[PDB]
Amino acid sequence: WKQAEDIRDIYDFRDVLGTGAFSEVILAEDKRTQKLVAIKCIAKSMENEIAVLHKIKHPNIVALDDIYESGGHLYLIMQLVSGGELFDRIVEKGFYTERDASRLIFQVLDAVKYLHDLGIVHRDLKPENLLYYSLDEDSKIMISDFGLSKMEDPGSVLSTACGTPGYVAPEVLAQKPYSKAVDCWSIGVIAYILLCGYPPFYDENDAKLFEQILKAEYEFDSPYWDDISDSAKDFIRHLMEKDPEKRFTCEQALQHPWIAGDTALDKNIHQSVSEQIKKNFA
């Protein structure tokens, strides 16, 4: 729990890697070592969440290198993960399959399972928070940010609702409290997008959009889902279940054939998935 009188004396900042509610991840360089880092800045129990995060050690989760305090400000220095955004790198691929998506999901699931074993809920499981570790083709994906406890706060909840409503669970939208299920939902949503390239929830009208999410009203639309195995759909349905109790846990999703068996198809779906990714996430 390092102390700093001025955070600008340790790090020079560039720009936002991904804002949150009470939090802003900015890229920074360590003034006296020149190391590029991701800095989760927060200003206002939660320091226990952050403590535990500092002890988080997993290949698929960004290492929280250390934490800086500046009187009224905490700066979570995360390992900078510069392989690219999940969807960006899916687009860049040539050969993209369910197996790739399954291997991507397995990594997020295993990472989220880890967080859940340690009783930490992500809360902010979104593709912008899922980055490749390296620019390499085979690279592991990293959960690169965290939703801190003060995301459960109703102000943050509605901010989450107003941001990209598609990645947030039905319960969270219902102003019902966060749970480990919330993450699994988001893995389901990520899974869904990994296999078609578009949000499962996509109405032009906000009200209808929330209605879709709250009621988990999504479909595996043709043509996009035609070459996607029923196994993959089954997997998503059990993650993308409106009832958080009915929703699969990380373990249950990790034990699912599309993740643990050989049911993820080897059919190249890149052309369609990237075609849809570009059409949604520019």
Residue numbers in the entry: 10 to 53, 62 to 299
In the authors' words:
When activated, CaM binds to and stimulates the activities of a family of Ca2+/CaM-dependent serine/threonine protein kinases (CaMKs), thereby regulating their functions. However, the regulation mechanism of CaMKI remains elusive. Here we report four crystal structures of three truncation variants of human CaMKIα, namely CaMKI320 (residues 1–320), CaMKI315 (residues 1–315), and CaMKI293 (residues 1–293), which correspond to the aforementioned three truncation forms of CaMKI, respectively. The catalytic core of CaMKI takes a canonical bilobate architecture, with the N-terminal lobe (N lobe) consisting of five antiparallel β-strands and a prominent helix named helix αC and the C-terminal lobe (C lobe) comprised primarily of α-helices.
In contrast, in our CaMKI320, the P-loop takes a canonical conformation, the C-terminus of the regulatory region (residues 300–320) is undetected, and the nucleotide-binding site is amenable to nucleotide binding. More intriguingly, the C-terminal part of the activation segment encompassing residues Pro171 to Thr181 assumes a unique helical conformation (designated as helix αT) with well-defined electron density (an average B factor of 39.8 Å2) and the DFG motif at the N-terminal part of the activation segment takes an “in” conformation. The rare helical conformation of αT is stabilized by the hydrophilic and hydrophobic interactions within the activation segment and with the surrounding secondary structure elements including helices αEF and αG and the αEF-αF loop. Specifically, the hydroxyl of Thr177 (the phosphorylation site of the activation segment) forms hydrogen-bonding interactions indirectly with the hydroxyl of Tyr195 (a strictly conserved residue on the αEF-αF loop) and the main-chain carbonyl of Met168 via a water molecule, and the hydroxyl of Ser173 forms a hydrogen bond with the main-chain carbonyl of Lys167. In the apo CaMKI320, Lys49 interacts with Asp162 and Phe163 of the DFG motif of the activation segment. Concurrently, helix αC is rotated outward and Glu66 points its side chain away from the catalytic site, making it impossible to interact with Lys49. Whereas in CaMKI320, the activation segment including helix αT and the β8-αT loop occupies part of the catalytic site. Although unphosphorylated, the side chain of Thr177 (equivalent to Thr309 of Akt/PKB) is oriented inwards and forms interactions with the surrounding residues to stabilize the specific conformation of the activation segment, shielding it from surface exposure and hence from CaMKK phosphorylation.
